[PDB]
Every structure is written in C-alpha cells, then in structure tokens.
C-alpha cells in the first residue's frame, strides 16, 4: 500500500484529532491564494522538522461575489490539487481552508458555500485531508452569534457549510469557527454560545457529542489567555484544534513559534498548525530558517514524538512531575522565591542530547544507574546526592521556565580540592562568561558561588558547561534580585542620542518626547518590585507607565506585564528600558525624534537612557569625528550642552570603552586631536563639566575616513 495517511479520528480523551498512529497533527502552513503550489521538494522538508501535517490557505474570498466580474471559487484548483497529491504521497495530513486576503476578520457567505460545494466532493475520498470551514470570518472572536458581531451571520454560514460538506463528504473531519482571538474563561463561555447555537441547528439539541468535528482557534489572545480558553472548552466536552499562531523568542523583536503556547497545547493534548510558511513564499516567516522554528524548539527543551525522522530528540524533566521548573513567583506584588535545582536532576533524554558525559556508565552508582552522568551520595547540608567525576567538555541541561523575566542571582553549590571553571548558558545563550569557581580544599567541602544573570522569559534549557574538571556539583539555585539595579527615587529620563526626555500628557494619558523643561510632567517615581522590574509612575499624579496600544499612563497598579519595565544597566552609566512583554527595548526612533517605539537590542545611543536626579547636568550630544585631508588629525564637533563650563574629550580604541581622557578644559564645542596613529580606528566620547560636576559621556562617535 501507499504511505497515504489514514483518516484522523478524535482521541479517547476527546481533546483533538489525532492521526492513524494516535499522535497529534503538527504542521506549518502554505498558501495557494495568489501563488503557485509549493514544490514537492520543499513540502517534503516539513517531515525533517517533526511535522506530519500542512495547513493550506487555499483561496481567498471576494467580498463582492457573485456580482458581475467578481472572482468565483475554484480559480486555484490546479494548485490545490498539487498540494493534495504532494501531501498524499509524502504521508502528511492536510487542513484545507478559505483565506481572507486583504479582508481580514470577514467573510462572504455565498462564496464559502460554493467553495465547499466544489471542493468537498473533490477531496471527500482523500483520507489524509481535513476541512476547516473558513479562516477568521469575524473581527475578532466569539460570540459570532451576537447581532453586533463584525460582521454578523457567521454561525449561519458555518451551519450551511457543514451541511454542504456532510452531503458531499460524510467521513471527512471538519474544523469550525476558526476564532482569531480565543482568550480567557470569557472566551470559552462566548464560544459555547456559538457551539450551542450551531448544535441546535444541525443536530437539534444544544449539547451534542461530536464524533468527527472540532473547534478551530488561533493564538492572537496570547498564550496565557488562549490556554485558559482551551482548558475551559475541553472541560465542556468539545475537541479543539490550533490552526494559526505565532510568537517568537523573548527579545528578538521577531516572529516564529510561540514556544509557550506549543508547550501548553502539548500538555492539553491539542494538535497545532503554526504560522510559519513552507518555502519559497509566504506572508509571515520561513519555517525552515532556524530563528523562526527549529532553534526555538531546540533552545526551549520542547519535545514531542515526530512521525518521521529523529527530531525533536526524546527528552524531559527529571522530577517536578515532568514539568519545567518554575524560577520565581509574585508574593505581595514583589518578585521573590528561591528555586533549588538539584544537579542530579538533569533532563533525561540521552548522552549527547540532555547531557554529555565521557562514558556511558554511572561510575558513582547512585540515583540514576541507567544513565551516563556520574552521581554519588553527598555529605552536604540537605543530604541527597552530588554529580561528581566532572571532566572538561561535559555538560548538563536542565529545562526550566522563567515566567518572570529579569535579573536573577544564579548560585552553584560546589566542592573541589583546587579551583575550576564553568560556564552557564540559558536557551543556548551565554549569561555568565567564564566563571572561576574557588578551591574549597575537599571533594565534600562545599561553598556557594553566585553570579548575577539576565534571563529572558519562557521555557529555556539551563546548561552547565564544565570548562575544567576537578569539581563536584550538588545543586543550582535561581532567585530574583532583591536589591534593584538602580535606587528607588524620583528621576528624569534623558535619551542618550538626542538628549530628549519623556513627558506625561494628562489630557489623553499619553507619553511623548520633549525637551527637558524642568517640570513635574517630566519627573517620574521609580519603584523596584523584584527582578530588576520596576513600576514607573509620574510625579504629579500617581499614575503608572503602561506599554499597550501605544505608550501611556494608567490608574491600576503595576504587577501585570504591560505596567512592568526592566531597568537594565549598560555598564557605562546608562540603562536600557526592557519591556516585560516581548523583551524589546524602549527607544526614540533614529529617523523620527518624536516616535517612541520598542525594538530589539542594538549598540545605538537612541536605545539608551540616562535615569538621573532632576538637578543633574545634561550630557553633550551630536558628536561627530572626521579625519582631516592628508594628515593624522581627527576633527571633532558636537552640540553645546546646557549649563556646561567646559568639556572633556575622551578616546578609546574599541566601541564602548574604556575611554582615556586625551583633553580637558575645552571651552568650545569642537576639538582637533593630533595624536591619531596612521591607519587605525578610534572611538570618541565627550562629557561636559557643570559647576565642578562631570556629566555622563556622550554617544560614541566613530572616526569617519574619506570615501
Ligand atoms: Ca560516566
Ligand atoms: Ca562524568
Ligand atoms: Ca544534590
């Protein structure tokens, strides 16, 4: 027989459709709405990414149908046939749906009926194919059945299209509604209305036990709210099916897999279709590119059993009920708590996968006799076991979940006769550098070494890398910092590039950039709530900074994600203001001095902020360093700094410094540096001196050569 897949059926639990092997359907998408069918070659690549399914946005609907000259359904048939044929012979599943195009959150009822009058009987016999009635027919979620739904009548469209499909394809799985925003216990309650209205029409009774149907939903409420809505709906007896979602790594400023929601959907037993495309083309991000899928799975510790290939690797958490270890928690609106991760509870999975050890035997013999890591009993406070026989090159991964991002005290309980080296990365990103661990003088003589780290939010593998041997490891600890990165107080914010401040506007509760006028609207109380996170409130009325559909100010207190801001030091006296939600940094746009925005980390001055006492002197701006013709001379010029008596010109040979002060008492906004060596790069900054008080250094100026 052919490798064509057997018809999906609801699982015993009644949570989703699973394939002919009892496993969830997991896949990316492709479109044939205004483009050719993706080639066999590229659709095949799906199987190497642990996918067994493809989402097809088949055609997009015309609002004007069936007026003269409007595009009818059927126009893409020759390409949709190719996708059906190609997924058939690749042993993949296929979810076919009607796309929206430019008309998002909308549908045409008659276009959809005639779409399924055509396509339903055409693929009825195709066991690997499922029908999802329509992508996001309403703006933007339940209840569709409300008269004030935008637009109304979607439930009637679903009812009509289900009846059309069952006539022409009685065995074929149907995915309903495709709620764009499906969030909260509210979301589930509102969907139940639409589900009950649907069931009363089709089956005659508000509560029907579906044998071959499920609620399709998307992830645009966010992972927390979507998970709550799915849990609730599953409890009411209705299988679900994720058909479109996205997230990305915290701090990337880009899309890709929502790792957090995938983990929750894996736990609840829910099949999913992520919104990354099969090459060559698509409207979002390419699923074959590491940054948008494979690396995100690889960095997080996420695992499932793939239908084809050997990725992802089989792995999991040891202890803690097989669930990623939480790092901190909110207790009286302050981020606190110490999580102890025992070193001998490294993830299971294998040698080369969840740990690397130099041999396959546990020479110590304790705790985990079937694995390669070397474990003995320890005589340290709290008893238990320690990882010993640590050779250089070895490593141990522990899957954790940093629900609250920011600054954490990372602690290693260590013993060793002599010193040793280690390095810790989180999500395959170095957070420590080379960490010199002290000599204790014995192999059960214990001490705690501690180092401060900046963790991003989400599932992430903590990985101890042993750069030297000769130490034993008992446990690891993370707790959020109890003392902040900057003292509590009232401050003025000045952007490093342009010297501008942030100002409250009570009339529309907005925050906008302006020149530091010295007023209370441009003054801000700062209060640390654990983890380097801060509540930032205006001085005049006690209203808190809020990053949500713009950048404004609100009455409710700051423990929710939009009202919380990580103040992250640069190292050179400035800070960047990281947003707790996505990990992007608050910056003024180099391009438009008025526009405030959130972008991913870069070296530029426009992303950096001075958080200063109100009376502190302003730093210089606009520094520009240019080489003079035919000679060793750098001509510096900058803008005059308010209240400056003089300037100090400083120079370094790499970006960021340190900066050796080449000249002081400059009573002018320009300088000529004669001591520049032939054909070498130089980096300049300038500070001002106001009433004996030296300011911060300006933004860096790279020495500019000729064309
Ligand atoms: Ca071993
Ligand atoms: Ca070992
Ligand atoms: Ca231990």
Author numbering: 36 to 742
From the paper:
The GH5 arabinoxylanase (CtXyl5A) derived from Clostridium thermocellum displays an absolute requirement for xylans that contain Araf side chains. In this enzyme, the key specificity determinant is the Araf appended to O3 of the Xylp bound in the active site (−1 subsite). The dockerin domain recruits the enzyme into the cellulosome, a multienzyme plant cell wall degrading complex presented on the surface of C. thermocellum.
To explore further the role of the non-catalytic modules in CtXyl5A the crystal structure of CtXyl5A extending from CtGH5 to CtCBM62 was sought. The structure comprises a continuous polypeptide extending from Ala36 to Trp742 displaying four modules GH5-CBM6-CBM13-Fn3. Although there was some electron density for CtCBM62, it was not sufficient to confidently build the module. We postulate that the reason for the poor electron density is due to the CtCBM62 being mobile compared with the rest of the protein. CtCBM13 acts as the central domain, which interacts with CtGH5, CtCBM6, and CtFn3 via 2, 5, and 4 hydrogen bonds, respectively, burying a surface area of ∼450, 350, and 500 Å2, respectively, to form a compact heterotetramer. The interactions between CtGH5 and the two CBMs, which are mediated by the tip of the loop between β-7 and α-7 (loop 7) of CtGH5, not only stabilize the trimodular clover-like structure but also make a contribution to catalytic function.
